[PDB]
Coordinates of N, CA and C and ligand atoms in Angstrom, one line a residue:
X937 N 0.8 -1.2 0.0 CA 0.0 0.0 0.0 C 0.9 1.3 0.0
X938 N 1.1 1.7 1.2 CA 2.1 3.3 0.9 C 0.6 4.1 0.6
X939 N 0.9 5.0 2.3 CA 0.0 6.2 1.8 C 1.0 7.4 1.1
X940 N 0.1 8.7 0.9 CA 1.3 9.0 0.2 C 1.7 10.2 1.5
X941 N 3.0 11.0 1.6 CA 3.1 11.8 3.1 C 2.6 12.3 3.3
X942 N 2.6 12.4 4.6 CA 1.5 13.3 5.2 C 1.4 14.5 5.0
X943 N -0.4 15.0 4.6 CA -0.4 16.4 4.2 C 0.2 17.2 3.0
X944 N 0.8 15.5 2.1 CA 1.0 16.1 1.0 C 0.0 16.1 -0.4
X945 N 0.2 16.9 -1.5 CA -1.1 16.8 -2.5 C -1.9 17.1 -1.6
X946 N -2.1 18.3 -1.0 CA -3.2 19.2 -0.3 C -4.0 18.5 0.3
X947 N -3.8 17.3 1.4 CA -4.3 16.4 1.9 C -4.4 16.8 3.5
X948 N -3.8 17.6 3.7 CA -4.0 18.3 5.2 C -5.0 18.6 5.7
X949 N -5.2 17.4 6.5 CA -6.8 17.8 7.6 C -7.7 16.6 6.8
X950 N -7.5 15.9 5.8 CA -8.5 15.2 5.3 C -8.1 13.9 6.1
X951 N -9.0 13.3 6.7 CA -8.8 12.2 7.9 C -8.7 11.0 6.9
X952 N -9.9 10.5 5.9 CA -9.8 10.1 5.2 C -8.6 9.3 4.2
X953 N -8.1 10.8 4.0 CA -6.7 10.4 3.5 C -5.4 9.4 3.7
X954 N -5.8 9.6 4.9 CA -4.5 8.4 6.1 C -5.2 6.9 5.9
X955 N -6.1 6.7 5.2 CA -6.5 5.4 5.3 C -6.8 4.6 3.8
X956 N -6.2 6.0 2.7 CA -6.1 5.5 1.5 C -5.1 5.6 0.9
X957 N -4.8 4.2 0.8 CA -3.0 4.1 -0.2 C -3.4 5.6 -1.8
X958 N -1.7 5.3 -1.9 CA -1.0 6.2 -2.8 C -2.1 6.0 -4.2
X959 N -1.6 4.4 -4.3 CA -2.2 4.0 -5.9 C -3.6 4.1 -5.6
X960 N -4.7 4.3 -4.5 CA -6.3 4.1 -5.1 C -6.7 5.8 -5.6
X961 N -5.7 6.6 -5.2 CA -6.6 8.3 -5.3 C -6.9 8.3 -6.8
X962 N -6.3 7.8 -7.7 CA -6.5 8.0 -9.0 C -7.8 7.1 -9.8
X963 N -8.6 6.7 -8.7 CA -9.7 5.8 -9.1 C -10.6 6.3 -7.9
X964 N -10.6 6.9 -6.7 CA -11.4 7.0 -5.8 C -11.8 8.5 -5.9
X965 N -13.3 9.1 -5.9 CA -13.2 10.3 -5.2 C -13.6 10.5 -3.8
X966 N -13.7 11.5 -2.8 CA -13.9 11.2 -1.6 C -14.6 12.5 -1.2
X967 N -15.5 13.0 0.2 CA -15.6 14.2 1.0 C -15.9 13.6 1.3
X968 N -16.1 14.5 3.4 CA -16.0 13.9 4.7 C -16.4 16.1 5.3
X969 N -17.0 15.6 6.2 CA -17.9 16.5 6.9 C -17.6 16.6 8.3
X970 N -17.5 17.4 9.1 CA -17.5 16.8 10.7 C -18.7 17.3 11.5
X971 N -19.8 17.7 10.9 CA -20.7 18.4 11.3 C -22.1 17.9 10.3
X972 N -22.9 18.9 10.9 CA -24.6 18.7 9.7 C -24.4 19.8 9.1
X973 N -24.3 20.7 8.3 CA -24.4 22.3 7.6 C -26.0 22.5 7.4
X974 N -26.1 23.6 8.2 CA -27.4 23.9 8.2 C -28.0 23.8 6.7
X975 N -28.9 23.5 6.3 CA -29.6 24.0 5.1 C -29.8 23.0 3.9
X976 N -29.2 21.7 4.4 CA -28.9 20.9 3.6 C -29.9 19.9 3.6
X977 N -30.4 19.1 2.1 CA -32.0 18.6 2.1 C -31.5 17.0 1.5
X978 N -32.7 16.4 1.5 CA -32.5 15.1 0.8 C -33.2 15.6 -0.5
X979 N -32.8 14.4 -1.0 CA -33.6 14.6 -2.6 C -34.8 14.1 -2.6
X980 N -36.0 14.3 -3.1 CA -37.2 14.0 -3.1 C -37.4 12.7 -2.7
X981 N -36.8 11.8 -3.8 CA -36.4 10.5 -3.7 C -36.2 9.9 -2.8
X982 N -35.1 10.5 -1.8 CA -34.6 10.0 -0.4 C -35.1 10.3 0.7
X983 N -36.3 11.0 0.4 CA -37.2 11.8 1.7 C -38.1 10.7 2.5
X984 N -38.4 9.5 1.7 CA -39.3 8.7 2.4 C -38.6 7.8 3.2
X985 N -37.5 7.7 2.7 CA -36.2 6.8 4.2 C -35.9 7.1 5.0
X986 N -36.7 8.7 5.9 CA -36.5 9.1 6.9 C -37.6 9.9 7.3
X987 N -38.8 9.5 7.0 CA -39.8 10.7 7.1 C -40.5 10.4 8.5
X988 N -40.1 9.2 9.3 CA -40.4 9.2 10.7 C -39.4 8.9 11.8
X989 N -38.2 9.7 11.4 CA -37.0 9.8 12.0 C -36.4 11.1 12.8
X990 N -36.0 11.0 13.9 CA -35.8 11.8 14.6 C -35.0 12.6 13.8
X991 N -34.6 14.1 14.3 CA -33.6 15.5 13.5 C -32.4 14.9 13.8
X992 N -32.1 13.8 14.9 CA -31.0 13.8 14.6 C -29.9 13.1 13.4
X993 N -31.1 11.8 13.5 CA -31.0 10.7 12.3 C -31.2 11.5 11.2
X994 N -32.4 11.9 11.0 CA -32.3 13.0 9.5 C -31.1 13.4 9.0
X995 N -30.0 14.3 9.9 CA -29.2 15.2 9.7 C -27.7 14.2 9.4
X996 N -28.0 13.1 9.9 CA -26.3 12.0 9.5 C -26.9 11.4 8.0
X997 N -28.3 10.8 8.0 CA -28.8 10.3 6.5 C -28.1 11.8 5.4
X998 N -28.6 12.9 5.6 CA -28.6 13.8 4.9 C -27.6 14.3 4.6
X999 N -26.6 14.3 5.6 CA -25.2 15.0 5.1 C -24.7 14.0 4.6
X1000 N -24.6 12.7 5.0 CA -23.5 11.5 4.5 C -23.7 11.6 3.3
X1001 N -25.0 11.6 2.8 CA -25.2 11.7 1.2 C -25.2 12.8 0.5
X1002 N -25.0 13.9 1.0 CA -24.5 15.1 0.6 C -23.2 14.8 0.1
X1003 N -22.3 14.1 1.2 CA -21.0 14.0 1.0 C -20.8 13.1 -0.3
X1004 N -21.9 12.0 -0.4 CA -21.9 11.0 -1.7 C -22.0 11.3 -3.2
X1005 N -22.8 12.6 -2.9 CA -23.1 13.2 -3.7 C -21.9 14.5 -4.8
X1006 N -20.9 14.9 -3.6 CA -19.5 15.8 -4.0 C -18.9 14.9 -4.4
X1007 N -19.0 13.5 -3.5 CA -17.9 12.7 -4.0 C -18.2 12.8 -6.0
X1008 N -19.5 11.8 -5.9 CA -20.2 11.5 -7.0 C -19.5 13.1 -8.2
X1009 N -20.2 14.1 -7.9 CA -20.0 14.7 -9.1 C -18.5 14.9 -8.9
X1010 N -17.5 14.6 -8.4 CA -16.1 14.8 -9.2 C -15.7 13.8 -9.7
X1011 N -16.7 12.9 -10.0 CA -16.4 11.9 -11.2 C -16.9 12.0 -12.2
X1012 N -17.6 13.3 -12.8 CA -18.7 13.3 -13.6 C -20.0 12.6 -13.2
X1013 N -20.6 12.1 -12.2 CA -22.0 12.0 -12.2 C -22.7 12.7 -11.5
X1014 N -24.2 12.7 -12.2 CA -25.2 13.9 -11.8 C -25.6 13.8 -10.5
X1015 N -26.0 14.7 -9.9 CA -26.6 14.2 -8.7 C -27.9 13.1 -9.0
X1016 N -27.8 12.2 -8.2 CA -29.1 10.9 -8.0 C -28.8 10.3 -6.6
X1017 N -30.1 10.7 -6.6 CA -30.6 9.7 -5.0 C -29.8 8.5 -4.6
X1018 N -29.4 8.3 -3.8 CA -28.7 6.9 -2.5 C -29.6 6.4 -2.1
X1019 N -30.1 5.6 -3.0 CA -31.6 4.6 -1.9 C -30.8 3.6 -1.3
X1020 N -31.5 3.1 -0.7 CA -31.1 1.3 0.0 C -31.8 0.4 -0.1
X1021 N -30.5 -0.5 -0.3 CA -30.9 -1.8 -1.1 C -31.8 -3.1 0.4
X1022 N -31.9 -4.1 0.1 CA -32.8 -4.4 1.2 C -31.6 -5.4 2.0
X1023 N -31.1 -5.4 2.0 CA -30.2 -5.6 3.3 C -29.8 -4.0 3.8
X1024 N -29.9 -3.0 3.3 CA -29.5 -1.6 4.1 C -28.4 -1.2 3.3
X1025 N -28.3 -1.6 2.3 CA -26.5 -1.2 1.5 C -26.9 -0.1 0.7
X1026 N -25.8 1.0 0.4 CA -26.9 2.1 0.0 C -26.6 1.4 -1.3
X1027 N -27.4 2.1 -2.8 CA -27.7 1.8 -4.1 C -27.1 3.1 -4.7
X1028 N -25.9 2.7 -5.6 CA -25.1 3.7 -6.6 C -25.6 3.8 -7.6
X1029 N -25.2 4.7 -8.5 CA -25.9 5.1 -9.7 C -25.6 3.6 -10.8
X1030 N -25.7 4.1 -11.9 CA -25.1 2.8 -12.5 C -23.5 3.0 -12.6
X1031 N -22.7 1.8 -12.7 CA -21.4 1.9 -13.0 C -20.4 2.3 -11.9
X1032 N -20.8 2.6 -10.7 CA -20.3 2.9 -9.7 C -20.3 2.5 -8.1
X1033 N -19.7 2.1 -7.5 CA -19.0 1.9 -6.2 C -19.4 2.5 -5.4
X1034 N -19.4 2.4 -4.3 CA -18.9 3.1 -2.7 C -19.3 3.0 -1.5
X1035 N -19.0 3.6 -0.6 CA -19.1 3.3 0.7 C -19.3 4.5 1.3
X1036 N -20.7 4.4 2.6 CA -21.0 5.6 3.5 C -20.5 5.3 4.7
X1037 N -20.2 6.1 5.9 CA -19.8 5.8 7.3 C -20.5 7.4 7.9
X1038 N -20.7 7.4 9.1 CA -21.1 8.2 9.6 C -21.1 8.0 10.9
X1039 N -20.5 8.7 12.3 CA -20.7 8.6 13.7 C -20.3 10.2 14.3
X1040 N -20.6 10.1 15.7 CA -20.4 11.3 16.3 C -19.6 12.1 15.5
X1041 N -19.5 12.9 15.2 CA -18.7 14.1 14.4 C -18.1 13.8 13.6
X1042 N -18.1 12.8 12.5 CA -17.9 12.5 11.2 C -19.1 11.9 10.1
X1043 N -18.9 12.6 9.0 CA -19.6 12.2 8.2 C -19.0 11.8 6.8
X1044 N -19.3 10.6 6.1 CA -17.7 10.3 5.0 C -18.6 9.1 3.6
X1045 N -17.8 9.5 2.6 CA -18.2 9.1 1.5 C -17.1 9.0 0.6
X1046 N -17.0 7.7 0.0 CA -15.6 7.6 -0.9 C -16.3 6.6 -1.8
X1047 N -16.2 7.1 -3.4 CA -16.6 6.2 -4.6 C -15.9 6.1 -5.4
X1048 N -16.1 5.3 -6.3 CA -15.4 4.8 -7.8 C -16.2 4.1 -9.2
X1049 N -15.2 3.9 -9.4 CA -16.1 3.4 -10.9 C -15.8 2.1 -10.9
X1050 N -17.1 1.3 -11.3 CA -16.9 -0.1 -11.2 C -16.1 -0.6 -11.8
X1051 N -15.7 -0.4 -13.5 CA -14.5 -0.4 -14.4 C -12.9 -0.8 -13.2
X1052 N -12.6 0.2 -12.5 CA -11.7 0.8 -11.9 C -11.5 0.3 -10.7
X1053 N -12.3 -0.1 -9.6 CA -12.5 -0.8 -8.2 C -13.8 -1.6 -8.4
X1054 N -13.7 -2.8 -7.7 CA -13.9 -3.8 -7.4 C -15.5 -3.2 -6.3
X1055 N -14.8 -3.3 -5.6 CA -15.2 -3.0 -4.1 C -14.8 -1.5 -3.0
X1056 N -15.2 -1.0 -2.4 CA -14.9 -0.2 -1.4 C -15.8 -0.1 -0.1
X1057 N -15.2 -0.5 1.0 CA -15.8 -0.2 2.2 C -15.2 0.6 3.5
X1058 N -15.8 1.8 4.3 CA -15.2 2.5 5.0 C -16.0 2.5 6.1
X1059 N -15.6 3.1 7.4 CA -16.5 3.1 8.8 C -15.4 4.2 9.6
X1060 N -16.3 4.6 10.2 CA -15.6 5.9 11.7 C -16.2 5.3 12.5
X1061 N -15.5 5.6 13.3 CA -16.3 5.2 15.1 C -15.1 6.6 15.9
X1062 N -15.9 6.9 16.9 CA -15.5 7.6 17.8 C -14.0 6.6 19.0
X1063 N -13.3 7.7 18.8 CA -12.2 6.9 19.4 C -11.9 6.4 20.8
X1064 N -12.9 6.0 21.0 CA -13.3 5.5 22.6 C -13.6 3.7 22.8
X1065 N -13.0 3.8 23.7 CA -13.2 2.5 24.5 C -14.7 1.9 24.2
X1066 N -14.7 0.1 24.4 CA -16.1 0.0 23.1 C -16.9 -0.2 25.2
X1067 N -18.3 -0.5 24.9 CA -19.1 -0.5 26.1 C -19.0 -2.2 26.5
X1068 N -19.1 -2.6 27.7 CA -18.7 -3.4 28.0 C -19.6 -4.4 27.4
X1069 N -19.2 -5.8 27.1 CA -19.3 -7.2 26.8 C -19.6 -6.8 25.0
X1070 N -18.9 -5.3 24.9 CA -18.9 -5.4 23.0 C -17.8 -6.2 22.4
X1071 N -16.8 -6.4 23.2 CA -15.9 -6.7 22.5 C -16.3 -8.4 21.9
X1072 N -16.3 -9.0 23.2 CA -17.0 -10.5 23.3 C -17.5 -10.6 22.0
X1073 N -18.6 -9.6 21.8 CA -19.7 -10.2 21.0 C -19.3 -9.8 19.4
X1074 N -18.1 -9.3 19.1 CA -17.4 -8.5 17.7 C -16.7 -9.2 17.2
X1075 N -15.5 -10.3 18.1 CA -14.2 -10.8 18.0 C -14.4 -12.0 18.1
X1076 N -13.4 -12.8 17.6 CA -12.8 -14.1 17.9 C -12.3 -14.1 18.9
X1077 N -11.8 -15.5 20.0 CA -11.3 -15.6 21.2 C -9.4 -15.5 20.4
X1078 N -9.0 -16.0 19.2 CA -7.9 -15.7 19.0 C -7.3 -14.3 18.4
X1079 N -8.7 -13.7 17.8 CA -8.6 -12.4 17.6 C -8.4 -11.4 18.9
X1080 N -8.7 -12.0 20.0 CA -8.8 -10.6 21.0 C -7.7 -11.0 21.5
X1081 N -7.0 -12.1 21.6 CA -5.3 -12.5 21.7 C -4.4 -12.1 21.3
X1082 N -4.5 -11.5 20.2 CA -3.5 -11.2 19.0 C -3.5 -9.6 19.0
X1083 N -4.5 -9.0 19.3 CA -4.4 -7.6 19.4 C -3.6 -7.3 20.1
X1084 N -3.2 -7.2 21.7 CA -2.5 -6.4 22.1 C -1.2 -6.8 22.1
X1085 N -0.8 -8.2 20.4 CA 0.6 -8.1 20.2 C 0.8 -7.1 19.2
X1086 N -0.2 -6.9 18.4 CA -0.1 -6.2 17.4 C 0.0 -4.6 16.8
X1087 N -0.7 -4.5 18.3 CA -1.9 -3.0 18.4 C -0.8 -2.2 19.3
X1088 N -0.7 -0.9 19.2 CA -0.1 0.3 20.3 C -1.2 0.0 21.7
X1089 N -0.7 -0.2 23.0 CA -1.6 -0.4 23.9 C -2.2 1.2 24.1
X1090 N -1.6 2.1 23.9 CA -2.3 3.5 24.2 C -3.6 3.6 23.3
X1091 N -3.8 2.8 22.3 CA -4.9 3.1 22.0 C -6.0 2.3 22.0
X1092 N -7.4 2.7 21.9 CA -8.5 1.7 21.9 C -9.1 0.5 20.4
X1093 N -7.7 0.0 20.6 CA -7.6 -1.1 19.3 C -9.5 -2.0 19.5
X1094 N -9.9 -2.2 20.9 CA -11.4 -2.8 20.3 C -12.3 -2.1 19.7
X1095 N -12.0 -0.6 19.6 CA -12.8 0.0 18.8 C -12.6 -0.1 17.4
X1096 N -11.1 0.1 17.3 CA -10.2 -0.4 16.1 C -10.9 -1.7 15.5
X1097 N -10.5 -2.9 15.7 CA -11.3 -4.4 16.0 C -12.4 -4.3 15.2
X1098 N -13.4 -3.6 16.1 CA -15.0 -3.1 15.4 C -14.9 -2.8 14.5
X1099 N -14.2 -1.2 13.7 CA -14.5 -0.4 13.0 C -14.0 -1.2 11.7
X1100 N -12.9 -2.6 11.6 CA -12.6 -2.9 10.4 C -13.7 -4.2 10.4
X1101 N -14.1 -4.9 11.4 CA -14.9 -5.6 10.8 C -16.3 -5.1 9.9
X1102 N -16.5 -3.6 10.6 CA -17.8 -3.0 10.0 C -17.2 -2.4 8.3
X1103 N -15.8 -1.7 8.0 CA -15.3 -1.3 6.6 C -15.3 -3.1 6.1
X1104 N -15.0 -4.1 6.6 CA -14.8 -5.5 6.1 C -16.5 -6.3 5.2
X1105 N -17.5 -5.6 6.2 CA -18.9 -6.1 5.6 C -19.3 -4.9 4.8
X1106 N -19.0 -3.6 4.0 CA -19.4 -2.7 3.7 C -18.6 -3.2 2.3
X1107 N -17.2 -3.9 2.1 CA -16.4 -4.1 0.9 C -17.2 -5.2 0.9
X1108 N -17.6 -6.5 1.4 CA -18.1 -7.8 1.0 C -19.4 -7.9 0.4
X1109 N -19.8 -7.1 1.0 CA -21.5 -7.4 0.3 C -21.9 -7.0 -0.9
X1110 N -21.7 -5.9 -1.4 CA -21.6 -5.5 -2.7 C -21.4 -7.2 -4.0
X1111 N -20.1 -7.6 -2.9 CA -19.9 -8.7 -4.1 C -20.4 -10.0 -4.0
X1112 N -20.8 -10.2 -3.1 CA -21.7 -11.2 -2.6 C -23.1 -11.6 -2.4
X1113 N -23.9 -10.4 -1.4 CA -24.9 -10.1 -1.3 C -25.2 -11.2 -0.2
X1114 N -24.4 -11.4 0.6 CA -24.3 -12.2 1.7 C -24.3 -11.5 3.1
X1115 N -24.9 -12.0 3.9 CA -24.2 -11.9 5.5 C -23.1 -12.8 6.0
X1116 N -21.9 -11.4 6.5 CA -21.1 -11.8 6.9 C -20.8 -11.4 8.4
X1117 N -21.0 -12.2 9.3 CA -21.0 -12.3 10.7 C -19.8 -11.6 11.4
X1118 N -19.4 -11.2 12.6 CA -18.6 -11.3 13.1 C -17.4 -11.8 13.3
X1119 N -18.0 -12.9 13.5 CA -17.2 -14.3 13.9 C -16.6 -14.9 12.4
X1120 N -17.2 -14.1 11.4 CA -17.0 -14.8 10.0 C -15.5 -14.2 9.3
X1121 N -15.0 -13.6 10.0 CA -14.1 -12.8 9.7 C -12.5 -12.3 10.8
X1122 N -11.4 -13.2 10.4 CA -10.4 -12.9 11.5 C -9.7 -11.7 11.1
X1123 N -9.6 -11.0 11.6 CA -8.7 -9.9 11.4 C -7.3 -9.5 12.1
X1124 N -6.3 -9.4 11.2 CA -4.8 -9.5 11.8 C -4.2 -7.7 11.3
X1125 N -3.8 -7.2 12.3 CA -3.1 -5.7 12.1 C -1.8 -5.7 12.2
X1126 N -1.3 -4.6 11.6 CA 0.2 -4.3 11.4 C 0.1 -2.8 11.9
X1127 N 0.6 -2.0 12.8 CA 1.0 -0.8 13.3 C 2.3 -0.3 12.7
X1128 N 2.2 1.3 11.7 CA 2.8 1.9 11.3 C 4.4 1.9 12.8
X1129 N 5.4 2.6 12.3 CA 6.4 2.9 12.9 C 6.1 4.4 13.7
X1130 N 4.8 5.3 13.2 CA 4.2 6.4 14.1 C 3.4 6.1 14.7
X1131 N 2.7 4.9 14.7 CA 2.2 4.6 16.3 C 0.7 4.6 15.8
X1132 N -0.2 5.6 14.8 CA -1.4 6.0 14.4 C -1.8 5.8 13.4
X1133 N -1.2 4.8 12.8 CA -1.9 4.5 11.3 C -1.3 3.0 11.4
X1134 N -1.8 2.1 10.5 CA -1.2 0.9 10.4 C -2.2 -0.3 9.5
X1135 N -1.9 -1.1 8.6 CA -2.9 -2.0 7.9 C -3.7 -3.5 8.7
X1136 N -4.2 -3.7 8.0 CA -5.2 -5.0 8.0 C -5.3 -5.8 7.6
X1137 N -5.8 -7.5 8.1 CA -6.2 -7.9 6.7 C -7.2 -9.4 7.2
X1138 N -8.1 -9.0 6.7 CA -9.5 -9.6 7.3 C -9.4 -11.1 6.2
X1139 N -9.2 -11.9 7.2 CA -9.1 -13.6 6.3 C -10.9 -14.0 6.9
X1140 N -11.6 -14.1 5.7 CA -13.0 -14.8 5.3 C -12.8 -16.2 5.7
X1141 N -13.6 -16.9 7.2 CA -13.6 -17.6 7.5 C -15.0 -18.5 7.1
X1142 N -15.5 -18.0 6.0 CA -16.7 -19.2 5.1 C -16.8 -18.6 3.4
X1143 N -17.4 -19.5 3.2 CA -18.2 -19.1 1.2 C -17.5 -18.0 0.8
X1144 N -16.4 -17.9 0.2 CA -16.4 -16.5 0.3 C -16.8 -16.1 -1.4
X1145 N -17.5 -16.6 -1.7 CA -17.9 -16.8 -3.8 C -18.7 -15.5 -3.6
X1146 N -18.3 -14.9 -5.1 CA -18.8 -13.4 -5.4 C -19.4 -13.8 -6.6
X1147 N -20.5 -12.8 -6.7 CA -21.2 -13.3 -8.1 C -20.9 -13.0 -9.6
X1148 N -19.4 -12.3 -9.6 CA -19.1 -12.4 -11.0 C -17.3 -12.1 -10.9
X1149 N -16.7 -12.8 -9.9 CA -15.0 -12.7 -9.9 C -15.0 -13.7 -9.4
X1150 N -13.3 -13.6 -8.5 CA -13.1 -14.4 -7.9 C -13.5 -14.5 -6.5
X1151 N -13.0 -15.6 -6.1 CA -13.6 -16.1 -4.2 C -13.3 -15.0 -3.5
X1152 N -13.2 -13.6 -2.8 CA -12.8 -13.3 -1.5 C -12.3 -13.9 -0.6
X1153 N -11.2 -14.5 -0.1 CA -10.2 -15.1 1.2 C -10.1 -14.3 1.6
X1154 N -9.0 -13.1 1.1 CA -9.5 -12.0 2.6 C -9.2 -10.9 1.5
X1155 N -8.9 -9.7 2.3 CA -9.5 -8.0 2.1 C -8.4 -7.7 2.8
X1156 N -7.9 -6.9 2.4 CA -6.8 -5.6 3.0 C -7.2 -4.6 3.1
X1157 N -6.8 -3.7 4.0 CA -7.5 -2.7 4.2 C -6.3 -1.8 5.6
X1158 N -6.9 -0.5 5.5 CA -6.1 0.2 6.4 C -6.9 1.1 7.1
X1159 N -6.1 1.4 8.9 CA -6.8 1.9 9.7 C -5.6 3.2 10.5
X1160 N -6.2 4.2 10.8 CA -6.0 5.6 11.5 C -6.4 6.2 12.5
X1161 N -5.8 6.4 13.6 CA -6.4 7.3 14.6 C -6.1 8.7 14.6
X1162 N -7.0 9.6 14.8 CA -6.8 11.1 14.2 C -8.0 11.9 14.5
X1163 N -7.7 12.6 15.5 CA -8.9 13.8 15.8 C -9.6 13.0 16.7
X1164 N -8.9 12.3 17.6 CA -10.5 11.5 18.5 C -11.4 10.1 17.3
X1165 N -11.0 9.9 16.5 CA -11.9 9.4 15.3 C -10.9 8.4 14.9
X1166 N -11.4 7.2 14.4 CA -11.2 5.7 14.2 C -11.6 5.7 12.8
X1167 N -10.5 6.0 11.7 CA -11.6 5.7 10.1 C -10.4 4.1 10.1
X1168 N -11.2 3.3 9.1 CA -10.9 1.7 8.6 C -11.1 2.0 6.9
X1169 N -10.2 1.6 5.9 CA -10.9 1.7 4.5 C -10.3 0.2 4.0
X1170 N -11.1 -0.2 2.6 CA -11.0 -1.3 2.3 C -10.9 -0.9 0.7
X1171 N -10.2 -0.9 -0.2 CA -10.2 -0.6 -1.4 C -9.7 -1.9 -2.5
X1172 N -10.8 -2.6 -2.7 CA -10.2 -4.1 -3.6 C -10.6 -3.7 -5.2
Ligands
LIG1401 MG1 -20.4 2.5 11.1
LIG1402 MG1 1.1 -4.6 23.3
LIG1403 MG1 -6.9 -2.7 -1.5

């Protein structure tokens, strides 16, 4: 992988960034939010996916796809509604890829062209300790072993843990259209030499057959701590 340095190619402050190698920028576009901006609407289309949902829910549906939407037009496409598909996966225009994430003070959207990427899956979580008996229910018993060989103990690697198995089902389904469990997926990390960035690589522990490539065995992917915030990305 190789991200490329930090803050370079006018990359400073994009969180995002730290979690996508050198070679995907030239097939990925991306925006990321850390707030709701007042004034901001769904498209007609997308109005009934939320029309009995709290302001707060409203305002993460609405911006994340705001963000899908900047992403979208710096690839050339028009603005079009993000519906969801019926497992909950959002629905791209035609010809195109991507992945939504959204939590406490982030909002994030990164696409591509199917030509170009395969797959792409991303997730934030807030950089905090997970609530108790989450880990249990996220991890393998040799996964929760292997973390604090792998992991900087200063940070909250079970949130880490979480946040790549959630970018791990965000890249799989797309090509599958499968549920993939928890437990369906081992995940082994590598920590950068700065302590805050470092890769992944989620080994598919069933079926892993896609409906028009090859099998998925596993997914690589990379993860960042930065600003309080946990981003995971998966670019196949
Ligand atoms: Mg998430
Ligand atoms: Mg350790
Ligand atoms: Mg990749």
């Amino acid at each position: 992988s190789g991200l490329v340095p930090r803050g370079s190619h006018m990359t400073v402050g994009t969180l995002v960034a730290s979690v996508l190698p050198a070679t995907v920028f030239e097939d990925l576009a991306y925006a990321e939010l850390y707030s709701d901006p007042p004034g901001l609407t769904p498209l007609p289309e997308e109005a009934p996916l939320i029309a009995r949902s709290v302001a707060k829910r409203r305002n993460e549906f609405i911006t994340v796809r705001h963000c899908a939407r900047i992403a979208l037009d710096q690839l050339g496409v028009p603005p079009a509604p993000i519906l969801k598909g019926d497992k909950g996966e959002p629905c791209w225009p035609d010809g195109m890829v991507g992945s939504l994430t959204h939590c406490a003070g982030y909002r994030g959207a990164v696409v591509g062209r199917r030509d170009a990427v395969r797959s792409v899956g991303i997730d934030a979580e807030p950089h905090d300790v997970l609530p108790n008996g989450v880990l249990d229910a996220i991890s393998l018993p040799a996964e929760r072993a292997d973390m604090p060989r792998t992991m900087p103990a200063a940070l909250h690697w079970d949130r880490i843990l979480f946040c790549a198995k959630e970018a791990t089902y965000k890249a799989w389904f797309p090509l599958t259209k499968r549920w993939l469990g928890f437990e369906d997926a081992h995940i082994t990390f590598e920590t950068d030499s700065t302590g805050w960035t470092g890769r992944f690589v989620s080994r598919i522990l069933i079926d892993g057959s896609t409906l028009s490539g090859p099998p998925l065995t596993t997914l690589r992917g990379r993860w960042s701590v930065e600003r309080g915030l946990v981003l995971t990305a998966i670019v196949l």
